[PDB]
Amino acid sequence: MAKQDVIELEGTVLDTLPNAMFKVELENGHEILAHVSGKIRMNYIRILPGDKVTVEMSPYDLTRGRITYRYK
């Protein structure tokens, strides 16, 4: 949405990182280090390279994010 608090972006994950980290590339082709939300850590709703995921990130960051939604 249009916000000034959190920027909601999507990206496509290419690589799997250890410790709930993921290497995801934004729609713009930018690299971001992502973190899956606690629900994805606890619940087997795993992210696979090639998946498109919704990353929430701060306007002061845009290089690190956190995923709450995986595209289904």
**How many helices (H) and strands (E) are present in the chain, helices listed first?**
1, 5
**Domain map of the chain by residue range?**
1-72
* Residue 46 phi, psi (nearest 5): -70, 150
55 CB burial (10 A radius; 0-12, 13-18, 19+): buried
Expt. technique: NMR
* CATH architecture, domain 1-72: Beta Barrel (2.40)
